[model samples]
Target: LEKFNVDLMKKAGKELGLSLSPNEIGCTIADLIQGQYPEIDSKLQRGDIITKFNGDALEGLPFQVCYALFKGANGKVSMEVTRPK
Candidate 1:
């Protein structure tokens, strides 16, 4: 978390032209994200497994971590996954 705060602070400073230090960034994140989702287990966010991109398993998806599956005009996708018990 500390490392993330530092990195984000540097990013924000570079992008926003604000002189935010790691401590300030840490505070911001602490305020922004109160805690993990109450439903989170095994530290995997919103885990759902098994769906399809033309019958392929998306083990580590590059996009749409928010949705297990959604249709795109280019093609359809299927996702399959398993989290730690």
Candidate 2:
């Protein structure tokens, strides 16, 4: 995969009321803006690790691919995340 500008992804995420970050293991949700999707937002929290995108696991995905999946059309995506307390 080509080099992906991570900063751009983060900025875009922010513009859409999402705050995200990456880790050695996978990308995680730093936050979801309030009032955007109250029902969905209520189920998530900061530090929750995203495990899958559109039902596909994050493992082996290049930064660009992962970013693309997260930035689905219509600015909406379905993901599976794991929150470890």
Candidate 3:
């Protein structure tokens, strides 16, 4: 995840019905591109701040690392997000 090319990560996300970006700071969870993809599993909402992936903290992750979190060896991912409150 740390060493992957940014474009490669984005393309992978496209195939998975996702488009993502960073928060105000490049290190925090920010936004997901809307409408281009639909959720079939997690049903994640817009504005949700992802805090963890597979139980690992996502707080300090760059966008690339965040995307890689979803592309684990098993092809299944578990996430923890904080919705607008």
Candidate 4:
């Protein structure tokens, strides 16, 4: 697993820049909005499985909980993920 951090701000009436869908291991990067957040787009790829948020493991967590964790992180967001080869 590799770790990366990105600065995110929820803009008014704007998307989160990326989409995350729940999986058995964690959450997968479903899609990314092009040019929405260059830093995020560069660091994370579609199909990357997010294993941790900040320092907490996301395995077995529900989608709502996972989304809550992200929503709670309003600044620098640290994530650990496993990338498909």
In candidate 1, position 65 carries an lDDT of: 30
Candidate lDDT (C-alpha), each:
0.24, 0.59, 0.48, 0.76
| Per-model TM-score on C-alpha atoms | 0.21, 0.65, 0.51, 0.75
Alpha-carbon lDDT of model 2: 0.59
Comparing candidate 1 with candidate 3, which one achieves the higher lDDT? Answer: 3
> Best candidate, lDDT-wise?
4
Best by TM-score: 4
State in Å the error of residue 67, model 3.
1.7
Query: Using lDDT as the measure, what is the rank order of every candidate, best first?
Result: 4, 2, 3, 1
List candidate 3 stretches off by more than 4 Å.
1-15, 24-42
Candidate 4 lDDT, 6-81, residue by residue in tens? 4455555555666889989888889878776666767788888888888899999899899888767655567777
Q: Which segments of candidate 4 are over 4 A away from where they belong? A: 1-15
- When superposed on Cα atoms, how far off is each prediction in RMSD? 15.9, 9.2, 9.1, 2.6
Tens-digit per-residue lDDT, 3-68, candidate 1: 100111112212211111122111111121223222122222222222223344343454353232
| Ranked candidates, highest TM-score first | 4, 2, 3, 1
Between prediction 1 and prediction 2, which has the larger TM-score? 2
